[PDB]
């Protein structure tokens, strides 16, 4: 079984969003399909369901404004809702009963903005490592992912493979209006001039994709 | 129109102690009460359906009790992976609602932050704009002051924090403090220098670097 979602991204205030949820390994004429939200901060919240004979029920705090739609033979569940407020900001997911009593299965979610600003792609900034950002035999180095709209963001290393050791923070929202993180690890300190660090960051709202390499600070 | 109610918002537990967590509904939802598991950076993971069968793949410490208004989630030994938000929900009647989530955090002993700072990037200077970044690396509790200072002067209102959700291996958090500048701030000024306080310091610490060298 497995429930994959549409990509993330922005929609202004009084628009509409739509989010495709395409199933594999069950039936949509067997099993039903809910979506459910998570808004910032807060806790999940039940939207709605389409059950596998095509009747829908809604949450009722929402429902003049929410439609669930599928189309069997293609396997695929579709959210829809109109209206749209700042407060309907969150990671939307499609999940599943399948053969049990709780959401035994979940999509991997869908961050939706609401706003009226405009996707921007992120600036990408080393942050080298030096005799300032050593503590013995360990260095700490990162890149400092600034300036962009909506969330989110993924930074990797080296391609993924290097996991250790890395801290990537939440985004902060900054008073422009546009977020900024930092992701950092820490490695041997010898390791500095015989070992290539390279962090990839990949925008998907902008469907950027930058890497940066850092390299320890000259002079 | 069901309203749950976790209780308590969030705990700490060492490792290998027993944990307890509440979940109330507002009116009897009789059995049909799922607990879910959310791991930073992931979808909630389904533990426990129909207020006591443990579903599939889930290890035997957590265990689901209760009926009617009152449902319990039991951790018999905590372990280090189980660092997460907790949910409730139920499917009793529409509309399906869950709780607010019970935040599981590790005790742990303390463990003072390494410090370490960085320079605006050259590449970020030729915008126009300077970011300092202090980083706290690895240590416990959660509770920690960074100050920023430039040429001694104590800064207010240009910089902002993030914390890491705890890690699961070594129950450890890092912070990251950006002090923001525009460039013609930054080039008016020698020394940047943040001070941190943790309980795990005998003193306040200090990191400093000097744009003149
Ligand atoms: C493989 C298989 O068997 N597929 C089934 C699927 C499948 O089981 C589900 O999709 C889950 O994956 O179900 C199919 O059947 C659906 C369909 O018939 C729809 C129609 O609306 O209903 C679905 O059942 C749900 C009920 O509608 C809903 O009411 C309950 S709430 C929990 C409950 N049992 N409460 C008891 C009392 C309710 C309160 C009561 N108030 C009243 C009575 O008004 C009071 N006393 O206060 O949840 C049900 C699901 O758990 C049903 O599953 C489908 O998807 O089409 C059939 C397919 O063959």
């Known amino acids: 079984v497995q429930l994959k979602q549409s990509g993330p991204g922005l929609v202004a205030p009084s628009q509409s969003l739509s989010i495709t949820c395409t199933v594999s390994?069950?039936?949509?004429?067997?099993?039903?399909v809910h979506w459910v939200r998570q808004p910032p901060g807060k806790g999940l919240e039940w939207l709605g369901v389409?059950?596998?004979?095509?009747?829908?029920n809604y949450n009722s705090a929402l429902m003049s404004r929410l439609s669930i739609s599928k189309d069997n033979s293609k396997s695929q569940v579709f959210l829809k809702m109109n209206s749209l407020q700042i407060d309907d900001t969150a990671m939307y997911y499609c999940?599943?009963?399948?053969?049990?009593?709780?959401?035994?299965?979940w999509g991997q979610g869908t961050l939706v903005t609401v706003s009226s600003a405009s996707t921007k792609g992120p600036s990408v900034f080393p942050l080298a490592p030096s005799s300032k950002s050593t503590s013995g035999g360990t260095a700490a180095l990162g890149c400092l992912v600034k300036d962009y709209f909506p969330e989110p963001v993924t930074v990797s290393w080296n391609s993924g493979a290097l996991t250790s050791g890395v801290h990537t923070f939440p985004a902060v929202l900054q008073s422009s209006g546009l977020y900024s993180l930092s992701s950092v690890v820490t490695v041997p300190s010898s390791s500095l001039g015989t070992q290539t660090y390279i962090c990839n960051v990949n925008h998907k709202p902008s469907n950027t994709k930058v890497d940066k390499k850092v390299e320890p600070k000259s002079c | 129109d069901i309203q749950m109610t976790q209780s308590p918002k969030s705990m700490s537990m060492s490792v290998g102690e027993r944990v307890t967590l509440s979940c109330k509904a507002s009116?009897?939802?009789?059995?049909?009460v799922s607990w879910y598991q959310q791991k930073p950076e992931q979808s909630p993971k389904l533990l426990i359906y129909?207020?006591?069968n443990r579903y599939t793949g889930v290890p035997d410490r957590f265990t689901g009790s209760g009926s009617a208004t009152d449902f319990t989630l039991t951790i018999s030994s905590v372990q280090a992976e189980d660092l997460a938000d907790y949910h409730c929900?139920?499917?009793?009647?529409?509309?399906?609602?869950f709780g607010s989530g019970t935040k599981l955090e590790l005790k742990r002993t303390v463990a003072a932050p390494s410090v370490f700072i960085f320079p605006p990037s050259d590449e970020q200077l030729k915008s126009g704009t300077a970011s300092v970044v202090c980083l706290l690396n690895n240590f416990y509790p959660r509770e920690a002051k960074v100050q920023w200072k430039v040429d001694n002067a104590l800064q207010s209102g240009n910089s902002q924090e993030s914390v890491t959700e705890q890690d699961s291996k070594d129950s450890t958090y890092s912070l990251s403090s950006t002090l923001t500048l525009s460039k013609a701030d930054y080039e008016k000024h020698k020394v940047y220098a943040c001070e941190v306080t943790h309980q795990g310091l005998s003193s306040p610490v200090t990191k400093s670097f000097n744009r003149g060298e």
């Open positions: 389409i059950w596998a004979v095509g009747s829908t």
């Open positions: 999940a599943t009963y399948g053969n049990y009593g709780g959401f035994a299965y």
């Open positions: 129909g207020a006591s």
């Open positions: 929900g139920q499917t009793y009647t529409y509309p399906f609602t």
């Open positions: 390994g069950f039936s949509l004429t067997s099993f039903g």
């Open positions: 009116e009897n939802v009789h059995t049909y």
